[PDB]
């Protein structure tokens, strides 16, 4: 029971300081069980944190709470010892459950001079001369004024969720920019080992059991880059040669369908260019706002299947010498069409649909053309 | 600072998209002599503000994260955009509106319809008069990109910055641009900024992707001086009668492959002796098309049995890797090129017999 | 004051390594009845975990630690909940100790033994100097029960660092353990039990780790990273290797193949290279678990499907030429196209597919020349 | 129990690989092909030799090695029971001083054999320590797999008849190795945890799609199949394919119907998936239909259905059926499913013809 207890006070501690890792700068250096329960260094400020969890349905931190004076005492003898330097020192108070109280309300707000003054009570008004115990707790918080009004004034209480890990999942889920939501519990798990790890290595060898922020943004970075293998795009083709809009571009003759007509292709072959070339108007765009594919590896891919046009141009017009124009010029297309499908968009494979659709496009600016003579019956 | 060629005002957007959420949209938008005639009469700021208005109004966007960033190229003074700019609560928004209505009171025929459309709630515009954030331009824009970059991001890669703030630098302005040509609102998620910047960051981290950026064209100094120099793979070109564009994509593929292959092995990606097996497979694949075709047009011309070859390696010898690893086109053409250049392979049947 | 951080910490790093000696119907409860309670369900251990940071031993001869774990142990013996016929009593330490009571207890199992070591053991530690000695009283009033205990008794101590144990648990036990990424697989097994414990106290429900569930997970994390999908091999012979021109001489029933065709010299110290390098690939690969022969006839037959096509393809394509030219025709079509297959769903070089033709066209399954099971019957 | 074809002297012997660590290396012989463990038997003393010869060459760690044998059914000695029954120091000691009274007669037969293994005292009580005599019993392949379920941690219940039977393969293909290159049968529990990880993580990932095939050319449903003549043999039959090809393409058929069938029910792929699939194909054959009608134009009827039909048989393998990879009998057997259907086909008048 009680070893459940200080084990569970552990667990949130180790817990925390994840968390606090998750939301640090690349300067920012967390100890742990060195000075304080969580102490953090990101060279211009510093935050002292304690975790305290019992939550038997009774509030942990009251008006008269031997933890919280204990707490409180420690900061203050930590003030005093003069190593801290309280100009811009924060102290923070994390509980993972909600918990009420009038010293909380008191200690959490009232942040400035003039509501210092007017906070918590004169000498012992509230408390009132609690019960006999140690009470040295008592006197040693309230000797100094200053120091008091000081700590009041810099004080913070935050509570938790009523679980450690979905308060982790949720920090994560916030604060990294690209956060794999897909795998969360696999990334969470491992980046608990390795903080573990490291921590217990650093205590066995009597070293400093600090993190420096660096290292976990570095082991994050490789866990995530690992996990980010989406090999192959997706999306789904729905259009179909009964379509409203596949209709409208047939009639309307882009570039692309006049240079289709040009070596005189079936009624069939209108409708599945403007079926592909329509889809991959739209993928081109989806995957462009989710991060998938920019217009730098866009550029690329029509850059790749210039060349593979300018291969197949000399291809046909080697292998269909005599022949009727419009026989070379649906030669090369079909000879287009089976080829470009071999190529990579972001090394990320992509449908048939993309490749024939980014053929068209292309025509459609009259950089690659079928018929032998495009560019003067088009220019 | 990784071209230093992008507009300003998309700087400032980058940095801006690095402090923030996972769960945060800034809503960019922009106003624009020298002069300080921006002020309370300006037009488009309302009539953006009516814009914000209207897509308070809509539902389509969470106003409880959403960061209204409205920038100038200069510095421009006005009462109003300062009260709306230094009002971050909801007491000093809701003094701010009133205020702010005060002031454009009895205004011109030209803003009424835009003080109408702003004017049609009170929690909503003292919302995004508290989100509200105007920032102006700023003398050293790259610099703080990277600053912030560096600071702020967990896992940020020092060996490769220059070019990992090309490709998200880039993805914004591609966001820019389409937000401009839709004429629809310019909402930029952080949640898919921050998919683009870990893509763009584990492109770099993994050890599979031969990355290499290929910059060379036509109108080179490096290409046509190679090209006139005529050294032994151009000369090897010239004997099966290829056109000028041939010569040109040639000397393309193999000055990208020299710099590749010096960039891949100075890294460690590839070893020495792992470019010698890549050659030897591509050459045991350049004898296997050789006979194939010396087989199938068979009693042809010499020079088009020369074409037919070369195009046939240049089509089959794309499906091979590097060390575990896949390589570009040019990769391959290139390679191809550097063999034919010492005599080890090549395309005119009798090329050993004539130089 | 790290002590019961660290206490803590290897207290749940043997919670991991207990798992992984496990079989698929233990259950492992952490801070339950004792510090670890494994529970197979034909016996039970009880393990106690003491940690010291200093070279001094900590059981050196009355240490307190030492006698509350002894009168622990007789609690629950004495309370009957524990079944004393198949109960086993383990004391672990993250260093090694060296105390004449520890040497005496653990080298005990018989009755005879037990007694010897009973009677024996109130040597120096009948003197309660210090306080709370009624762990003394309660571990010495039985004689019975004592005995037992001795018995039952075994003292297992670390190496000095708890991960270097658990790495080198989870390297002897797993079989199979990819010790490639070793270092990831531990980081994702702690962060997971760490979960399960954490999520089962938050509920004051009982902290207790089924061997199933840990098994499930180590398999999906080991399946996660045993996704190699490319075969390597080292091919470095070439035509001058004394074994390639010994081949060739030798003339086996694929080099006789190709000389029905007709090819040249540079054909047949190429076919000879790779045959050679295709049966030196399967041999290693077969022998390393990564390929067996069950995967290497399908192979075999996928590439017999291809030649099927080919041979029509070529004979459609070469009516009315000389049969030697429409062999070497279906020959260097089969090696362009048997390059596309995959061997367990690995890529494999293009010598391993030329060796596989070879192979098969050295038992007479796939010729070259249009009438080869004729002319080579 | 995968195949129950197996041989008994390797159900339990990959039971004894299962239950080791991944340091042991096992050794493995059958001297049965009568009391065959008797001291007169050079089997059995050939076979100590051997094993001495390999711990005194330094290749074999004695310390992580044992000495499995084996006998067919059971067979008993004095000699055979001291080698299995000890196992402690003193008790090898012991073992290795009756079995030398033991041996006191000339015997010539075992004479270089007993002289070969009692040239060493440590050598020889170190292998009699790991030595272990198993006898071949009847219920072997029930043992396995309680044993595969009961020890393996992560043991798949879904997929069990076929991982024995891959893992089986392997300890069969090893032993058929060292049986024939003239070498000891160590299988080290290194590479047989190896392959048994393989096997389970092939069974367990969800990119691969896995058939099993046992169709072939002389199968029952194969001939009743080209027999009956349904649509897409009929649509062969215009371009006069050799009887060679109907069975083949009846064989892709009924494995692309079965499997279809096979990884719909199991979840691996969706109803919709495969009719993407379907939509992929019919556009290359559509595509192949117009390149070989320009290319071979003037051609007969017959050649042209040939050549369009060997031209969709070679394109049609690269396409993926929703992100995973399939065999060519997929293609196939989807390609005449459709053939069947008279939505695609070879003869250029198909549609007029039947």
Redesign the interface.
């Known amino acids: 029971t009680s ?2 207890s ?3 006070g ?6 925390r300081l994840t968390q606090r890792l ?1 939301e ?4 920012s250096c967390i100890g742990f ?1 060195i000075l304080d329960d969580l102490e953090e260094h990101t060279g211009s400020t510093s935050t002292f944190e304690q975790d305290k969890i019992s939550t038997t349905g009774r509030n942990i931190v009251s008006n008269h709470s031997k933890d919280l004076w204990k707490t409180l005492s420690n900061w203050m003898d930590l003030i005093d010892s003069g190593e801290i330097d309280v100009d811009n020192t924060i102290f923070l108070l994390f509980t993972n459950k909600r918990c009420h109280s009038e010293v909380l309300q008191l200690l959490s707000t009232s942040q400035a001079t003039e509501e210092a003054s007017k906070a918590f009570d004169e000498i012992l008004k509230i408390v009132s001369h609690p019960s006999p115990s140690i009470a040295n707790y008592l006197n040693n918080f309230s000797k100094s004024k200053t120091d008091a009004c000081r700590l009041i004034s810099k004080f913070t209480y935050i509570y938790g969720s ?4 979905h308060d982790l999942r949720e920090s994560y ?8 939501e897909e795998h969360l519990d ?1 990334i ?7 903080v ?2 490291v ?3 650093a ?2 060898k ?1 070293q400093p ?1 600090i993190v420096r ?1 660096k290292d ?7 866990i ?2 690992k996990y ?1 293998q989406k090999t ?1 795009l ?1 999306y789904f ?1 729905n259009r179909s040669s009964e379509s409203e809009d596949v209709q409208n571009t047939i009639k309307d003759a882009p570039n692309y369908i006049k240079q289709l007509n040009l070596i005189n292709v079936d009624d ?1 072959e209108l409708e ?1 260019a403007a079926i592909a070339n329509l889809e991959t108007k739209d993928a081109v ?1 989806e995957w ?5 594919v ?3 590896s866009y550029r ?1 891919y029509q850059r ?1 299947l210039r ?2 046009w ?2 197949q141009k ?2 046909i017009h ?1 292998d269909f010498n005599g022949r009727p124009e419009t ?1 070379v010029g ?2 090369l297309y ?2 287009c ?3 470009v ?2 190529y ?1 968009l ?2 990320k494979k992509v ?2 649909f993309f490749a024939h659709g980014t053929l068209h496009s292309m025509a459609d600016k009259l950089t690659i053309g079928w018929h032998p003579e495009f560019d003067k019956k088009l220019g």
């Open positions: 070893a459940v200080s084990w569970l552990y667990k949130i501690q180790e817990y998750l640090a700068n690349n300067s069980e009523g679980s450690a890990p889920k916030l604060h990294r920019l690209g956060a794999l696999e969470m798990y491992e980046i608990l080992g390795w573990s790890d921590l217990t290595l205590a066995e009597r059991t922020a976990f943004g570095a082991r994050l970075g490789e995530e880059s980010r192959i997706n083709c069939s599945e765009v462009t706002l989710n991060g998938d920019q217009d730098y690329y790749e060349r593979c300018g291969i000399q291809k080697l026989e649906q030669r079909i000879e069409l089976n080829n499908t071999r990579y972001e090394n449908g048939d």
